[PDB]
Amino acid sequence: LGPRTEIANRFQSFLRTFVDERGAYTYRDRIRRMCEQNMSSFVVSYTDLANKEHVLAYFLPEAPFQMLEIFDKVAKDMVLSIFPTYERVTTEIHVRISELPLIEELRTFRKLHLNQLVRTLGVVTATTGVLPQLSVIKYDCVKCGYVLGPFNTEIKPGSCPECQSTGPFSINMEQTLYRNYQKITLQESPGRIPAGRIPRSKDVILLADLCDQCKPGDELEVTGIYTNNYDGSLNTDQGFPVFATVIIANHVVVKDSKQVVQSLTDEDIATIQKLSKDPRIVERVVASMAPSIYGHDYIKRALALALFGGESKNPGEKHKVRGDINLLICGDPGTAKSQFLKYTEKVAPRAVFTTGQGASAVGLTAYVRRNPVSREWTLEAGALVLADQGVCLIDEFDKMNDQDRTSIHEAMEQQSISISKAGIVTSLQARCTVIAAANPIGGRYDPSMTFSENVNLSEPILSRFDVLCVVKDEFDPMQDQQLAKFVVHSHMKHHEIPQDLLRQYIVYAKENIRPKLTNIDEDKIAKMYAQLRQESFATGSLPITVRHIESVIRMSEAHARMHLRENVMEADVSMAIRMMLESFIEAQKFSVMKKMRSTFQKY
Amino acid sequence: SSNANPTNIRQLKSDCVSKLVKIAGIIVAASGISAKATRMSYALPRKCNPKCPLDPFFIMPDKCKCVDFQTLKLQELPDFVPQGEIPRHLQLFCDRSLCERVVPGNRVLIQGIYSIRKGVRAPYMRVVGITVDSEGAGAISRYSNITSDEEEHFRRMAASGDIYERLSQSLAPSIFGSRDIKKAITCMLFGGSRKRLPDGLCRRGDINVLLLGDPGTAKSQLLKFVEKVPIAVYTSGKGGLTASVMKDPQTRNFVMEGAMVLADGGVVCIDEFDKMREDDRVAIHEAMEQQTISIAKAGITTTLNSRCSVLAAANSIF
Amino acid sequence: QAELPRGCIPRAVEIILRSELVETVQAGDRYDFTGTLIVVPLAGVGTRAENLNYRMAFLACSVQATTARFGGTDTAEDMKKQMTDAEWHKIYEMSKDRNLYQNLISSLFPSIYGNDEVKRGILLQQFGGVAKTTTEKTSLRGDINVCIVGDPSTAKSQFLKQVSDFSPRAIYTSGKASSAAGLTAAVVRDEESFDFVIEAGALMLADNGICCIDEFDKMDQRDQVAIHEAMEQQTISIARAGVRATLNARTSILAAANPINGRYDRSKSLQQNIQLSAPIMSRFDLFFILVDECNEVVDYAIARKIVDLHSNIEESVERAYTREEVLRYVTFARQFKPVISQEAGHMLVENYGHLRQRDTGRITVRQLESMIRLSEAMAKLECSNRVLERHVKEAFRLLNKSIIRVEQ
DNA sequence: ATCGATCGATCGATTTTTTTTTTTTT
DNA sequence: TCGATCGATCGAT
Numbered sequence A: 001l002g003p004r005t006e007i008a009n010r011f012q013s014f015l016r017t018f019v020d021e022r023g024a025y026t027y028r029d030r031i032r033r034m035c036e037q038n039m040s041s042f043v044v045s046y047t048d049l050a051n052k053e054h055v056l057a058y059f060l061p062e063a064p065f066q067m068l069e070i071f072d073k074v075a076k077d078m079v080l081s082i083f084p085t086y087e088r089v090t091t092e093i094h095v096r097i098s099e100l101p102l103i104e105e106l107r108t109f110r111k112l113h114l115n116q117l118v119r120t121l122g123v124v125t126a127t128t129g130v131l132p133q134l135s136v137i138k139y140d141c142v143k144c145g146y147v148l149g150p151f152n153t154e155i156k157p158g159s160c161p162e163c164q165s166t167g168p169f170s171i172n173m174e175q176t177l178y179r180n181y182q183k184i185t186l187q188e189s190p191g192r193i194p195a196g197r198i199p200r201s202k203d204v205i206l207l208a209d210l211c212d213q214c215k216p217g218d219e220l221e222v223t224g225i226y227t228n229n230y231d232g233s234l235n236t237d238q239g240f241p242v243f244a245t246v247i248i249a250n251h252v253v254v255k256d257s258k259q260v261v262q263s264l265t266d267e268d269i270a271t272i273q274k275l276s277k278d279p280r281i282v283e284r285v286v287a288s289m290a291p292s293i294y295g296h297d298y299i300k301r302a303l304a305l306a307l308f309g310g311e312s313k314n315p316g317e318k319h320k321v322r323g324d325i326n327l328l329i330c331g332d333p334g335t336a337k338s339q340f341l342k343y344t345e346k347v348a349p350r351a352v353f354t355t356g357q358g359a360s361a362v363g364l365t366a367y368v369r370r371n372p373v374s375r376e377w378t379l380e381a382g383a384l385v386l387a388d389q390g391v392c393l394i395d396e397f398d399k400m401n402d403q404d405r406t407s408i409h410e411a412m413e414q415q416s417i418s419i420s421k422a423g424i425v426t427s428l429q430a431r432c433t434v435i436a437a438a439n440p441i442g443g444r445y446d447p448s449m450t451f452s453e454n455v456n457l458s459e460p461i462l463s464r465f466d467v468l469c470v471v472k473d474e475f476d477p478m479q480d481q482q483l484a485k486f487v488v489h490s491h492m493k494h495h496e497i498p499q500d501l502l503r504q505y506i507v508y509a510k511e512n513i514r515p516k517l518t519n520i521d522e523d524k525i526a527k528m529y530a531q532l533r534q535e536s537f538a539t540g541s542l543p544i545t546v547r548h549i550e551s552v553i554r555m556s557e558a559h560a561r562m563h564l565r566e567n568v569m570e571a572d573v574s575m576a577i578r579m580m581l582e583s584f585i586e587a588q589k590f591s592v593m594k595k596m597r598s599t600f601q602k603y
Numbered sequence B: 001s002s003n004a005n006p007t008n009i010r011q012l013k014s015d016c017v018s019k020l021v022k023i024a025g026i027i028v029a030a031s032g033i034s035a036k037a038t039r040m041s042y043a044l045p046r047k048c049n050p051k052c053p054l055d056p057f058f059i060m061p062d063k064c065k066c067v068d069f070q071t072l073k074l075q076e077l078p079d080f081v082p083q084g085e086i087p088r089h090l091q092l093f094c095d096r097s098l099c100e101r102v103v104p105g106n107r108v109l110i111q112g113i114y115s116i117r118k119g120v121r122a123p124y125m126r127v128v129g130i131t132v133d134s135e136g137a138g139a140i141s142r143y144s145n146i147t148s149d150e151e152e153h154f155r156r157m158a159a160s161g162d163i164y165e166r167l168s169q170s171l172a173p174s175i176f177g178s179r180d181i182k183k184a185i186t187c188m189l190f191g192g193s194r195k196r197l198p199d200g201l202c203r204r205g206d207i208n209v210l211l212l213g214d215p216g217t218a219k220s221q222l223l224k225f226v227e228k229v230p231i232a233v234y235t236s237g238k239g240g241l242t243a244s245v246m247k248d249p250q251t252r253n254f255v256m257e258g259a260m261v262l263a264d265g266g267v268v269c270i271d272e273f274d275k276m277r278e279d280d281r282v283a284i285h286e287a288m289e290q291q292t293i294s295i296a297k298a299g300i301t302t303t304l305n306s307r308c309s310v311l312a313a314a315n316s317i318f
Numbered sequence C: 001q002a003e004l005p006r007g008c009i010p011r012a013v014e015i016i017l018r019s020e021l022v023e024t025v026q027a028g029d030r031y032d033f034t035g036t037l038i039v040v041p042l043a044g045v046g047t048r049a050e051n052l053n054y055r056m057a058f059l060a061c062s063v064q065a066t067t068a069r070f071g072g073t074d075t076a077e078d079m080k081k082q083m084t085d086a087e088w089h090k091i092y093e094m095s096k097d098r099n100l101y102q103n104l105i106s107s108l109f110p111s112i113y114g115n116d117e118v119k120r121g122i123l124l125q126q127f128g129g130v131a132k133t134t135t136e137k138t139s140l141r142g143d144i145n146v147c148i149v150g151d152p153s154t155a156k157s158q159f160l161k162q163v164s165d166f167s168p169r170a171i172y173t174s175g176k177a178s179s180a181a182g183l184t185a186a187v188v189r190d191e192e193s194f195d196f197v198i199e200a201g202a203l204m205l206a207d208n209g210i211c212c213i214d215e216f217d218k219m220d221q222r223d224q225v226a227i228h229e230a231m232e233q234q235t236i237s238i239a240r241a242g243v244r245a246t247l248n249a250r251t252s253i254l255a256a257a258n259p260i261n262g263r264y265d266r267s268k269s270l271q272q273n274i275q276l277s278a279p280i281m282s283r284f285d286l287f288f289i290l291v292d293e294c295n296e297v298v299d300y301a302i303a304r305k306i307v308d309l310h311s312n313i314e315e316s317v318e319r320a321y322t323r324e325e326v327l328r329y330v331t332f333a334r335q336f337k338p339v340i341s342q343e344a345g346h347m348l349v350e351n352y353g354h355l356r357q358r359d360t361g362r363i364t365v366r367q368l369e370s371m372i373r374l375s376e377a378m379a380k381l382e383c384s385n386r387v388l389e390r391h392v393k394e395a396f397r398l399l400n401k402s403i404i405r406v407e408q
Numbered sequence D: 001a002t003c004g005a006t007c008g009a010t011c012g013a014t015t016t017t018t019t020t021t022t023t024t025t026t
Numbered sequence E: 001t002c003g004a005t006c007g008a009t010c011g012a013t
């Protein structure tokens, strides 16, 4: 046709006419970017469409099926023409959309939203597994033994190799194309409810390129399109025809983004190596760690480290060693510490929702024998399974039922679970990171008087814990003036890094680079651990074990990761040993200088 | 068979259908042995062969045939992204001579095919000439392709009278010391004699292990290693005192699914007999002295049995 | 329930609504519908014909979902919006009077007489917070706790039995009226839809409004230990039935404690006058306890309050300010975007330093957070932005009343 | 003598539910 | 035992 040809032709004169990012427009190269990796999930910007040709908003809703099909033909006739070798792997394409100027909450859509462009979100619940489908109409003639030929509706023409005969037929289990399939149950978040009632829900279908992407209990973003089951048995009716509803999936965005994620600017991506090789920027960990609270540099830098690290270093056959680490700050009820942690949750890739008083650690509907009675009888074991290679947020350690804080005592080093008490004995890894900022016994805080006296956390656990910190406070007028000025200024927001980047710096650092160690001075750690244990025997000396001297060299690797050095010299090792001198002096007596006098020669 | 390359369950999709493959997984359990046959004297059409109406077909099963049928199973391996998930699994199919070829709880190589039975229609797979695994000896658990060479090397190792003090340093190529602790973590595997007699006394065959101590001495790695090195399983606490009298929603009966069962020639290791309370210690009070695991719940008294040993870690207060 | 007979069951009716009628009904409401009963397209063993056994049904196409309606704030005059504060003609006066503080204090408690110190404070709770424009640092909070303790029945409860009827969205009751389902919804373990449904409660039914309690002391330490976090980091979570439960409460509170022995014998510290767990007694930023004594003048004044409770003509005292104008002025006073540019904003450092010069003989800056919010509220009361240095001094006085009230 | 409507002999298609034993939490 | 299928048949045209 004349006009009804122009759609693909405008896509053709789009993907090499519209430009952003100072030349070499993305879709000139995004498509080959994706044909390299054998993905077949090209994605479109709507805002770019509004920037180039705003015509494609009214022409769409009258049948967006045909819009998407006329899209995919263009990707085919581009790619398989320009990469003719490609026609081996998949030989099929479709496109995606991720820019819509509207988020339609649930319980808001009706018959007016029929068969047209949508955006909606919510939460997953139980649904089916993974199954394939059909794709094409082909039969096998049974009178004359031929095949009828290739052709929610049946076709069955009389034309066929059997003298256009043989109304009868039979079917093979091959030579016809198939299609993966899966279902979902979309429920709305229990935050944005009508405050205390049942929720509403719809079902959704997603298709073959989109499977093993979702999961039970997840955050969500989908364009989708509104379906219409064409007949749920129209007949003598109820007080309602038995009609139903689905949305069909075009494109998802997940909100957690637990992978290496963001697409790349042409020049504003090497901002890493615009500054990251200068010396002073070790302490630029802190200038965007949490510009919140005047003092407290040490503990926040320590968190900044423990958020930065990860390594498996699995030797031959033995085990998985360790790459995620225990922290704590069992200080005092008042120090602004709660607030330290929320920056981690809103900044880091992967984490979890909990306070103290979780389950009994048995878990919400964990043990359940497997039948299709009671509608599949949901299974889970806690939450560490649900955030691996992420972090756990906990507070009020000293305020939990002991027999759950018991149960959490396996992940820490072994990083694994193992269960029974059903019809099953399946097993599973728990690889993630712990952090807690709880409160002790006794009101506020003792003086520099010892720790094991100061809170009822037993011996065979706080050994599994390694890196300690304590927010000790006492009264000086000067710093009280200083921080008061800081706070009042902090409520003068009326009307050196941003958070924009260290997210990406840590993704680059934790994913790609995989550092090591070399023989440098590693005998001296022996003397220092020996001084540690010999000068600390019975005072507060129970938590002097081998993981916290795993930690030192591992933290050195984390330091050089913060440099992307990929190896390291004495500098970061001395820094780690310095930090531990610091903390382990902090949590000992009013005679706070024992290791000080014992250590000025190293310092 | 072949040696091409193994795959993973997460790529079994529509394109890999009616087509040969190779994978590597792990097993949980599989069915019994009902039947299936080839011919006798699917649609069985209309004609008869005064009238004889509309499909009067009498099977002559004196003249029918008979082959086997077993329905094997497969779960994935623990290192192919179950991290943000749990492991899925699959059910299978086996035909004529390969029942009693795989007991559950083993590592497999597999040669199979992904084909259907009836557009949401169903999956399944069968064997197209199974073989097995060599995770060291991935499948060497019941049969023998060991050769006189292997028996020779073995028994030539046996008379070598510097093998036991050699084997007290075998488990840890990374840990120091702790040798008298270790001289009988290896004998626990070997087992002694299960000597029954003309009277009742089926006396206790295997042995059993204990340890409790302050952390910081490498308990966990050692027990994980004893799991690693013939067949065994591991949990620790939180799991049972009951056994599995559930009900298949098909037919509504009281079947017995049955996992000290799964160490009847293997063994078992656990940590935390401590931090699992007493509602599930009494069934295991019993099992490990007589091995006649009894059942008396509903109208069944099938006191089956299982020969298992046991290993115990612990944590004492303070 | 407007037709409550005896005998038979609550006979159920089927009933239908059209499109624009949809989703403006809700659970818990009494109605006025249409009456358009219809022919509805086993055990009915009557005679059968043809040239069939029906049941009963019904539809209706009109709604008056009354007894669940307030309407927010829209003198017919000019204003920011249509009717949000069209009473400028008088609100101009209600924002410029100099005795307005006391005229407001005595404008809601004419049927009451006691102390005159929480009649000047508790407007605090209904009054605004901050609502400022900042970055993604964190939540910044607007409203704050209050507490009451007292001797047996000096009208501890009539303060609040009415306050629920005073402002909207803020329904009150106790939680020991029910299970521990005050915080969480009813924990269910039988199959109706998917065997575990806990997405509600009763405390969280007060979002952007208050839901106070009575008998604050005798309640189990599960809801209460959950309160230990739920009031500041105003985001609550659970396990054992939670689809990684992420809720949000937002709101203030009012306490209803009762001493240990039911007396105020000053033989022990306050923290031992109640002898509970401690850290909670800071985030409650003002207590203002009511005391009992034995003096006849007060009690005769009370009885002569009852002299004008039932003398059916003029059974109360005259007043100066009516309630509706008060409430509308209050609900106008929030939407202002306050401002801070004042030397008190520069010079609160010495006020706090002096506060802790007195405390140089519990402690610190939770109270400070309160302080600047108490006073930014008392300047909201001045129908004005642009913080001033006097609301400071009043707030400082209230602070010191609270602490020296706590002092032995 | 051509053709549509009605009759009637010919064909194939439907018929499984109430207790129990473990399990998490008050 | 119920239903449409299909083929035959009887007046109109």
Ligand SMILES: Nc1ncnc2c1ncn2[C@@H]1O[C@H](COP(=O)(O)OP(=O)(O)OP(=O)(O)O)[C@@H](O)[C@H]1O
Residues within 6 Å of the ligand: A292, A293, A294, A332, A333, A334, A335, A336, A337, A338, A339, A340, A437, A438, A439, A483, C232, C279, C365, C366, C369
């Ligand atoms: N030194 C400080 N710097 C910045 N903000 C502070 C400081 N002290 C208190 N605050 C503010 O006070 C509020 C209380 O936070 P804080 O972490 O002190 O409570 P908390 O100690 O966690 O109490 P709990 O440990 O019982 O949860 C926070 O909003 C915080 O911003």
Ligand SMILES: Nc1ncnc2c1ncn2[C@@H]1O[C@H](COP(=O)(O)OP(=O)(O)OP(=O)(O)O)[C@@H](O)[C@H]1O
Residues within 6 Å of the ligand: A321, A413, A414, A460, A461, A546, A547, B174, B175, B176, B213, B214, B215, B216, B217, B218, B219, B220, B221, B314, B315
């Ligand atoms: N004697 C040792 N020699 C070498 N490495 C050791 C030794 N003991 C412990 N380790 C190191 O510490 C880890 C072992 O700790 P393990 O998990 O046994 O503690 P645990 O026994 O589980 O503590 P708990 O009994 O309190 O749980 C190993 O990963 C190992 O690298």
Ligand SMILES: Nc1ncnc2c1ncn2[C@@H]1O[C@H](COP(=O)(O)OP(=O)(O)O)[C@@H](O)[C@H]1O
Residues within 6 Å of the ligand: C111, C112, C113, C114, C152, C153, C154, C155, C156, C157, C158, C302
């Ligand atoms: N100053 C006062 N003004 C009005 N009523 C008062 C005053 N002092 C005491 N009362 C009376 O004291 C009673 C207190 O009862 P209340 O404390 O509500 O019982 P409970 O302790 O069971 O809640 C009120 O009913 C009120 O009549």
